[model samples]
Target chain A: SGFRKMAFPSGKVEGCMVQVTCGTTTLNGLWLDDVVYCPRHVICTSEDMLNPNYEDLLIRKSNHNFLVQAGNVQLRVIGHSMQNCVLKLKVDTANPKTPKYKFVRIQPGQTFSVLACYNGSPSGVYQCAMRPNFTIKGSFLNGSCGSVGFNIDYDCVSFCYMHHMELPTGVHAGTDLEGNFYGPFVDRQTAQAAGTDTTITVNVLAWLYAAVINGDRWFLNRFTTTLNDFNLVAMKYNYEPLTQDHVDILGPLSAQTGIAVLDMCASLKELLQNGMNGRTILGSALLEDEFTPFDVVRQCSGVTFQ
Target chain B: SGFRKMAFPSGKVEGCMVQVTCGTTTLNGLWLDDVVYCPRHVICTSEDMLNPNYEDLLIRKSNHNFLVQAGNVQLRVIGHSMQNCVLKLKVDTANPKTPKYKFVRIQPGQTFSVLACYNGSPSGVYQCAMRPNFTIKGSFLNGSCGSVGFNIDYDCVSFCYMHHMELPTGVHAGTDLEGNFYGPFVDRQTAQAAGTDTTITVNVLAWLYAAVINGDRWFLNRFTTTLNDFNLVAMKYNYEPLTQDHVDILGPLSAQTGIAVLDMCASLKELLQNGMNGRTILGSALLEDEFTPFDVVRQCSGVTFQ
Candidate 1:
């Protein structure tokens, strides 16, 4: 019945956007403010790296191929003009896996975001290592947008919670105290009737099935296009960044945090070999400040800065 | 097997900040979707006299620090301690132009959650303190509950559309078995604003709108996630002592498994949301009459099945 949280600073610099209220780590003044997860959570981040300097990479290193408790990557294309260029996007696990890529091309001042995760939630048996990358080919690849470079204010989280409700990971958000109307959210019983649960992002097949029976196009389009059910996009592609006005069938949501599918896959195996109880942590170093105290169940963790 | 939509915007000139008074919210769903027109969710914290001070408020977002709102004055305690000392907190809505101040308190093994009112709530990591305080002082003990270190679990939750609603709460700690330390459990005040902004100051936020929406409270027992746990059946009027019937009310109930309230809510919600999969959740008494754990959570609560 005991929980331990270990927080350390990331070894490198992080973009300002990482300091946003909802980002994984806290910095500047934005953390633990509007954003807070469970007490069992640990946050790590380095000193703040100002803007412009952070946009040097097409995607920040820390963001690329990292193991996060949250399952999705929220990529916000900021001030990027695709007037004569195209940004090719790919989200998948590391090597040996071939999933299709999505594309993006929009004018400046336009808002664009992508919710990318592999397979998707409960994630129970599969730990999805979502590596969402944005690369360019057309003119912007080798060429430049002059001094006006673009930076994707990216967020990687673990939960596919309600698009409108904002709660920390492990918690489900309901209809809001403010804007945007969604139908009376289906209850567990109602959702179960369609052979579905409340999970909006997990169990895609069930949702689609329910939507079919319920004739809710909102459910149909959401699960089909954005969530990309059945990996609808091609394994390889010649797709253009859709330049047409693309409207989301549903409200966009901020990412929430969650536990890894490590238990479902191989991660738990590593713990078992070294752990006395079923709970132990693995990290680059040992926790120096934790208790020497006893008489309680022990949960563990590790530390590394990247 | 049906889904229908029959709601429209109540009103939408949508101010830079929308304030839904004690009774109604005009900014339905669509209007706020235009996040720009109204980016601020203006929750004013105000109240005349709250329950034993901690009774009326609700604990919102929490982590290392927590924010609670009452009437006008907000209280934020820095890291708590078991070397705990006599502690007393007071906030006054009597003064309008309140100058926000900062202070500290003992750590929360009593699992102390703060309060305030209506609008947008709290967030931050939290740490609780434990000690043999009444007799011996720990490395950190301030001593209260009669210059006697109080080790009580205090918590409060808020609900919507009404300024004065029910505040179901949970509290206490130590060898009282049914520990009779200090039992404010948790509280809420009327229209009280912490006047505190995004700071670790985990202030009392219970602003009007945010406060009204936050009802009752559930302070989860941290160490266990199973049978050795307590489920809080909170309030509906005058903030009753969490009206309910329990099996033992002691032994923390045989929580034989030490399940956390948070884990349970998330477990049930997950079961309902994604369909028939709830891990880390198996205990009993688990009753809520018939609010349907899944359906009730749609209202955004901790343990609402009633």
Candidate 2:
């Protein structure tokens, strides 16, 4: 399946960072907050990490050269150096082997921006850019580069976790058996950044992976419950009192059967033991099959954690 | 939902014993085998339990009265003694509150039959006949009665079981969580006879009820799995080698998961306990919410059963 069909772009963007470069200079310390990128579905605003030197370079060439500015998923360039600063801009596409490109040109004193909208494309290359208007301002416009936005909500990240190894049926995001959406964060670089903390992130990823493939909706929706009006509603509709037999099976004599929160903390012990050792769950042959949380934990197989 | 809405008519017409009374005579000791009673769905025939005396009465009154014969879901009568033996046939409608009646008349030597087909009605009364051609044969003609047929297959019985409970989205029968068709027997009398072991039948009914509410496809699909070349097809798709981890969670890695089977078997035990005691599962508020077999077993609560 194509990466477009395998990725979920509707996830909430969060904790994302990208590296921007112009010419041979790497523009470090450039950070865009809450930037979302899915080839066509990009939403990036850079108020924090807009490089001063980079902006100065553009301003300096505003009257003498073809100035260029590139954001995570957008490109802005002003051809103010000459009256007719006819220049072409092209960026990489989703396919790495056969890079697709979109080109735009600039006129003197005119600023041009390339806005990648959701209705247009899929998530892929939000990377290197090339200049085709190489004659007039050949020395002035050599090369420019920018990183795509990454880091997404639980839904997006989970989707990415699945898409990394398997092909999804559709492009749109959907809840797995666990009722949580999985995402293939914006790109490869972002994914690596998110997986930096091998201990914690890996453990959580393992848990999510297990929960998803097992189709454990309950554990996925797990939470700490406190008494409230909502609890009353839950009590009325979804509540069932624990019988003596139940207590006997559960090995407790708890009188109350309100929304007793199951501390998934208990699972941490087991999770930490095997979460980091490359464990995985399998998918069902039948699309309609519904799995359980127990099904997940039961299938976990991996090396013992150090 | 009302019992009428919950119960299916295709189920064996059990606990059904209709009496046939004439002007002053009540016919007894007559029985029909494999009888069906619903308006459009019927199965009735007789090898035994056909009263010879009743037949003799009909032949004897061939010249003096209106003679009648009744089977499960069908009735026939001949106006022989006089011309135009006007008669009324009033039987129970599916709903007792509104008894349905079908009337007919017979001419000398003319036979009339009442046929209840599947595409027409539900189940209930399927017997009894009276003559309106009184005067000449009035003294000789009073009433006549027989039995209906009742027996069905797994498909029919299972469909009836589902129809007997819950407002199914479709009319077709499917597996409950336990994978059983939920049939007590193949014939009406057989079911009634099985019901004689009230405790066992009631217990099984409870388990079936639990399995259905939980939507346990696996349990519901459980059956004698025979193998052919198709097993090879299954081998390819569902194959998963048992890992040491799987055994550890299951039991004493002595080669299996211990308390594993207990999980399912325990559910059955609890279901039986609560089912016979009038416990019930709730319908979804969102109508479309799909429940898993886990959903059902988790809700089971009851007293201990021996």
Candidate 3:
């Protein structure tokens, strides 16, 4: 658990900022856009942006410094109060018994970087420079031996995923638990099977998130159409749409289902809220899509305005 | 990037622990295996164990602690010498211009915790529990914060992946750059197209790595046999094995090209080391496989013995 692992996607792709928790550490990972920002996996097709997180991953994230460089993302902990702070990277040597550890002291507002490339060498990141490939996105944060806690503010790489690409294991296209005929991915897979290009770029989650968040009347009915797509793909895969009856358990169906988008948009929000945590809709990739256009509002770029 | 991103496989199949790097961070990520071990996206059918890395994923990694709890993995920075240490996590807030950061001081022989989950509320991880999902696998190390930066330990979720499960877009397996015959995924796709099951799981990469590493004479011919599978699958999707000529510039054919395993294993490593980075095989999923049974020596489970 020295320097938690990070992912440098082959390249950036439509990305969404997400959090993954491992051990006592919870770090941020952007879904699309490559070129390491932190010790996390990030992606996005920046230049040919299809989703939204594009500018965020490139411009804003780049400004984050972590996104700027290409190497290891180490935290530079500056000591705040009268006391200095410590940063440790425990070491497991040939002797596995009482593992050995290292410590680093930081001065206030300055000094923050722990464990460098732990190659065969053992000089805590400080010496990793002497080794090689030391692209450092040193995340400068205070150890706060001092006081007030702080928040992490990076223009979240806001983006959405078009779920129609691939299929999950152990699933098929047919009527779902609701007994409605469905099969989006399978449909897509067919043309894909028949040999065609993947050009459907409707940023499903982002739109859904946008439609629901703004309560924009125009896109309401669009929900049903998207629903078709959703069921098409969703059913083809293994995600079981909530039983028509299950929607109310989590919350009121602020939303509902219908043949039309207006009919559908009505309950979209409620539908989402009504979803459960462990369940597919409320969680999984779909849950994260909500953020695509969400922060857009807070950021002033969402549907309400744009 | 830092140490880099490492992959923890959701085993059952042949899972390969991969590495991802960001900023100055380079960490490990296991391909298979699940259950929050780190702030990362890890998968694999742990109980069902389809891919592999099971024991490695669960047993070895859990012992890694960083894979233990459910919270942030903040390092415990300890003051080593007369001087204490610093571990900083930069915070961006209301004042993005001159971002404010906090710090923590550590006493010798104890302390490391960085930022906690960045909920609306903020608190250095030292106080995250004061907030929510505070499962911590506090990685302990002397901020060396004294000396001797260390290497990481933990059974690599040494598993592998059977690429036959899916297909990659762009091209089909007809004639490759070398102009041979191929088409595995498409074939699998048709059945998948036709419908049945995904029962073929030979642990491709792991076997390749194991076979090559050990120079297992018996499995030699299996290489050519597997080549049919490889090309069957590889050709269908994409992946051009270096042409007979280009391989030399990088290194001698430590091996050669043929339809036989005896023939294949001979030049496997050289082919690997010879393959360019941007190119697929040498770098992608295949590269990591070498480690499957590799450290096994070094931990004692590779083919030479088992």
Candidate 4:
């Protein structure tokens, strides 16, 4: 379970209370469990993208709206403000008869950051975009047009020292030696019910759930908000710069390093696609939420700086 | 649901790695979430700590030994490196006749810089108080005879941003405009089979199950790691002072934060508890695979002039 915790610092940069200070923090320092999901065989479950007649090993779903299979759905949106933002999942399909835009509405905004659970794929170009208003919190469009920038590339990462907790495998079940909180469960509702109020963040929700299953409330929240619930503001990462232009994702990096423009797009997608349901566990989460502009005319005008 | 994204400058610093072009970066952020479980509830669920009278209102058990009903849990560690720890549950009541440590093992650690989940009280007294090999991972152990050199405080919470899939009241079952992913499956496994790899991360696992149950392949890893998993190394806040000390978790910030001690313990426990059942995801995660020292502390301690 690859669970990534973002570090976001809200401070008065140059005297502005809305300024941000953040970096990609380390998981070593923060206690957590990253549960990753990797499947050996996952094809473009979309009939149109499959091109059964094409017999293509890997078909390019680009240019043409293609459909891809979505085994599990993880939705995460980082909002800058304290308000809630509703995240909407949109899909685009090549089939004009059955366009992919006919999708449903999932979880509404209740916090700043959220990791939503979904069952299958959203039958088209599953472009999981966030809408600032409605249920999801903090989905506001703040970027401008001229200051387009998007220089996010392979850069340096931050580092911090870390500590470890050493325990036996399963012996400490009833004791602290083995280091387990709970075991199996009869249903998910039961686990959810048991873990509902723990103070731990959603980033560590799974571990907390496991703890509830393990019969420990080590990280449960003590407070209550709306009866049987705890209100927590997750670490968020959403920054749209002054420039709101769109540019070709492919640039010098592609030509210099055998990496693809889609790689950047994919990275962008992955940043929002995976992780702990986009829930924040730790108090501080670093993020690259700065926005840059992109466009077809200006070419590579909006590049992310630093 | 409040999410934030941030970044820091990448330049040289006059720290331990003065000769290095890039200086180690750290994050500083804050979050408040709703938590259902309280520490007292957890104490009540403990076999030894359990008080029959408190079971109904205090303890909420999800599994055999897994229970929550506790208050908020605090941490004094970094954030990024602790993404893979698991929770182990145990119950021990305070009975005169059974005074042989009739409590669950809260202290979790088998080696250096590794830890497991432990219980916490509203008083910020974490059950585990052991230290890991800091020197090994580029960290420092400058605590008093018993206490580590960090402080933490938490508010009793109800609404939590902790679950992998941040579903908004029944939104898990609903879809977006594209109609691909479904959601709100209670557990991770269920989400996995239902949702493809799109929701592969721990947070999205539950939602993935919900998606899969909805019978859509949109959950595949295309947007997420479900399609193809890659190794994207990023810097994290290592309690120590080295890059090699970093370990991969599910995401770049899986455990990157100020609560390294608590989060790391939790991650390690998860790693050992799941074993073969979780080896693949665990191995594929991106973690704070580097090392750092008391550098983080130095910054926090106001040792650095910057």
Candidate 5:
């Protein structure tokens, strides 16, 4: 959410590794471009006394153990002999109650890094050494080399971003659209299952009220389309199975925005209720002259008639 | 489970760097031993295209996303300058949906690494650079460092091991012993309040059945010892308040495993059912022969009459 403008004084530290330490807190970074300038948008760090000997190793401190941002400890190959060396890095919680560890190999010409919070101080400690034992087949002889230690923290922006990209924790039934997934079920089915006798009545009324007030044409059209298929609407509109009068009546409500439709709305509500069944469907038929307004609106004009 | 036999053709490639690129995948390694070889076990990378100028600079990518393995991306310090540098690393999901990141630091001489899956590709991506902005109190210069990118995958064995080391998800009442932690209720009083009738019956039967089949002397001892205090057992064992013969018969079971211990086990089962008396006390007393095999086992070796 916030950015800290970073300036590389070393004149464009090309992919240069940088470390920042303040008080007991320390941080690591990577300069992306030829940088005399940089934006340390989010710096993840922790208030842990890091192991002095290793870059990724964090000493467990009972007192100071809170992270300031979302980041990880960086380990790299340094010194003249670091070329073509087999390095092994490990992180451990070392907690007697719940011991844990992570391992990785720092191969030649490879820069290895991980997220800071996962395995950093108070939480865990890390150690890296030249693992002389490595073969093309993946086993090794035992030897040693230079090692480093470090610690970590997290930033809000990065935190929010990662959470958004996280895969589903566990899976169940669902549908996906544009990488975003939707429900395993919708409102209609859920309501029915939960015994929604009054809820359906209330919600339908609410939806209609909102639609009428907002004069949402698309919503009104869909609503009318669905209602017309029911037998109740056919009888009310004085038609056997279809009627242009009913369609016209339901079509343009925008022209009558100033007119109070509450009464007509009430009439419609009553009609729906009278035919309402235990399920989502309404009863088989509707009554005649449901209301005078129903026929009046058929003209689709700015009629001042209430 | 597999290995890669690596040979350093350059006599003694001291700290020689190694990079492996297969298909769209590329990995780097370091050779620690001053000889002709080393092995990089597993390599994990991210979909974020790395900065060409900086070997470790993997530009943050939003589109092409896919995590190759359940591993971590490895980044190591190379060249002569990384000495005495403390590095920090951070990995974030950056998904915009579930943002979560990890932080860790690479201390002075430490080689830092993380759990392959924690903040690695597909699940998360990591970044690290030298943070020169450290004060004696561990503060900084408003600057950045050379950054490199690497990803990771973890071995199943290690993954399983870490999970096993995980603490219980939640807490509950229990002693150090395994079975002591069971039961929906704690004390006899609690059991009564909660109506432990059927529960007691089922569990007691289950315990006895297992003990009998396994000829477990220790379990039989503990089991019989517990029932002896129950009021129901008191009556069935022919004791007003308590008795040695009753205790003896129910004390050991070596002589009854092959015999009709089924009847005794059945009798015990029935007694538990009839006089459950709300709690675990039973309706205070037993009828007869309810202590047979229980007592026999306490005397150690039997007469072999079975």
Candidate 6:
């Protein structure tokens, strides 16, 4: 799979740093996408910021330039070891049998670096469709390539800390008598054969590698939370399960419920870890079951951390 | 600031959740504006998943229901704790001194909760011109008085950790004062009292908090990474600094070197900590110098893990 699909939140929150590595000969260029900044969306706020083009998006990211409306449509690519590497973005249009494609591109890494921006664009998908594809080439680690999405809060301090490396699906702790094992997907039916399992594993690994390079922690929690939230919201709206659509959407757990449950767990962890003293902005705002700051820390401690 | 926003992603993305902490007590129906469910925006790739609205265009967040959106307006308080409290949201056109006002009335100790959804509505600076006044007479926590504004990325993860206590600004021993300090902004211009030196102190505190939250070992690091991405993009575009806006958007260091420089330091930390071999994602991302996972972990770790 090309760059695995991950949401700004479902996989990782914005403003984080991650590392991408490979077991093979040096890695190539790393890619990432966000909700509004994905290949299909648009950047609306930075109309007044800087370059509002695809090239500027990369330059802005490399420079840590941020526009007022720089929502989830953030992108960055970093490479190591190579003398030159061109960054390219492609839409994984579910064409398993087809080849990938890029709609845009820029020439010469230096020139491309200068064109990045932090503002509104023709569309939201701030992709780095490397043109002259042969100009820039990323390495395996003999050097470094790629840049950040934007600057620190020239915006505000709505910073976040997300759980890292929790399998999108809960890990399987053990194997059954039949030799089936538990890992990231847990009790769910295996999607493919042993090879398919390997594919899924590899896909997750590659995505995780991308996530590491992007430094996305909230992704794990976000994945779980969104999955559950869909279930809960759908249920409230009288959604039905057992349907192809529902199964596809909800999978093993109710989308909304699963997302919400995980979110609640995440919240609990945050609350416990960050104790909230007796100062509520409004007394009525406190919940009977509200989590303490410490709860968040307690639960999160178990996730991937240093 | 209020209930954080999130986009409903496509078919089961694995882990995702939504949680809302009761911010205050109220006794009136809560109305949210600019809230839309979108497959694309939320990172869901299903053909019929959903669509985002205008408000979705405004804010990019991941988890938690504290703040919700509809079309033009958003739902901040009320649903969580409006029993004894009457929530009043109106654009204070009657008084030039006041422009927009959103308040709630809540009893001493009570909270409320509800399902959140998005209704299509265009976002405007001042569209709702007439409405009644309201106030919250009880406890209010996150998003109680009103969001500080420019609260980037609340949806992916909520800001769970807080400090009832505050601190001042300064450089650390291990790290050099990388950039210049902004706003010592006093009409008089002095050290002890430039808009309460509190701005600098709070700014530094906030950065530290964010750093820890987005650090390698913490969970919020995910959120911070996303923010960093946005920062990079914005800076690349030369996005205007929000120093002149409502709440202090740009930090003292924001207008100067761009977040990438600071992110570099954060990345260095992650890499130095055995990130490549240890925290795969964080190490790679940080090493790539694309984003900073440091601030996230620092801020997240600050949460009291009871």
**DockQ per candidate:** 0.01, 0.01, 0.02, 0.02, 0.03, 0.02
Give the alpha carbon lDDT tens digit for every residue of A47-145 in model 2: 312322323333443322211222235433322221111112232322112211121222111111111111121111111011111111100001111
Cα lDDT computed for each candidate against the true fold: 0.18, 0.21, 0.22, 0.19, 0.21, 0.21
Clashes of 4: 300
TM-score of each: 0.19, 0.18, 0.19, 0.17, 0.14, 0.19
Candidate 1 Cα misplacement greater than 4 A, ranges? A1-306, B1-180, B183-244, B247-306
lDDT of 4 by residue, A83-124 (tens): 011111122312122211111222211111111111110000
| Docking class for candidate 6 | incorrect
In candidate 2, what are the lDDT values of residues B233-269, reduced to their tens digit?
A: 3234332222333223323211221223334333333
lDDT, candidate 4, at B192: 29
What TM-score applies to chain A of candidate 2?
A: 0.25
Residues B216-294, model 4: lDDT tens digits: 2221331222111111210122222212223232223333332232233343333333332312221122222221222
TM-score of 5: 0.14
Interface RMSD (Å) of model 2? 32.1
Model 1 C-alpha lDDT per residue in residues A155-270, reported as the tens digit of each score: 12212111211112121212111111123332121221111112111212212222222222221111113223112221112111221121122111101112111111122122
- Model 3: docking quality category: incorrect
For candidate 6, give the lDDT of residue A114: 10
Q: Which regions of candidate 2 are displaced past 4 Å?
A: A1-60, A67-147, A150-262, A274-306, B1-306
Q: Which whole-number lDDT from 0 to 100 does residue A89 have in model 3? A: 16
- Best model per TM-score: 1
Which residue ranges in model 5 land beyond 4 Å of their true spot?
A1-306, B1-306
Q: Candidate 1 lDDT, tens digit per residue, B1-306?
A: 000010111001111112122112211110121111110111213332343322222233122232322223243323221111111121122323221211223321112211111132110111222221211111111110110111111111111111112221111122221122222221234332221111110111111111112322232222332322222221111111211221232113124234433343333333223432222111111111111112122222211100
Residues B23-114, candidate 6, lDDT per residue (tens digit)? 23111112223221121112212331234232342233223323333222333432221111111222111221221223232211111111
Return whichever of 4 and 5 wins on TM-score: 4
Grade the docking of candidate 4. Answer: incorrect
**Candidate 6, residues A241-268: lDDT per residue as tens digits?**
1123323422222231233333433432
